[PDB]
Amino acid sequence: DDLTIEILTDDADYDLQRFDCGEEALNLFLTTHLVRQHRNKILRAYILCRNTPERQVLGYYTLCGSCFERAYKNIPSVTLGRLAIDRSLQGQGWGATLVAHAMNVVWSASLAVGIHGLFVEALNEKAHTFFKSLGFIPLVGENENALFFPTKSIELLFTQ
């Protein structure tokens, strides 16, 4: 395959204007906010691209360190806040491959500093179903848009 998954490169140029995932909010985030938020350290942005000098982006995901707390304890974690796949690639399982990439990054970081899980943001029922099919535990009430996956399950994915 011609496609690769890599973290956004600090001094590289990307072809993003053409990107279309079907959600207007995720498109505008990529073409006006993603690059500056990554470079300004607000998040860590990972790109699915064509591995050409032109760097045509056909999907992306964003990560940021977080902590989960109850209305007692604390959970050092990582949040996957955005996931978008271009319409041209949809149906080939690229969304799931990007989550597996994310999980491997989060796993490596747990092995280094100690992170107990991965939280994900699902703004709609189609994404919630997608994250549930990948094994994420759905949270309820105020946390209805969040799903959780522990580091121990990620370790199981890349060791068995």
Partner: protein, 38 residues
């Protein structure tokens, strides 16, 4: 985009996920195998 996750009974679901971690399903295993050789 959440750096402060504030839980309630969602807290027990996360606690239970930590003590009883889910087994990776076939869909996720496929994604992991696709990622392996890329």
């Amino acid at each position: 985009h959440r750096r402060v996750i504030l839980n309630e009974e969602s807290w027990t679901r996360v606690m239970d996920a930590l003590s009883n971690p889910p087994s990776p399903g076939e869909k996720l295993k496929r994604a992991a195998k696709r990622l392996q050789g890329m």
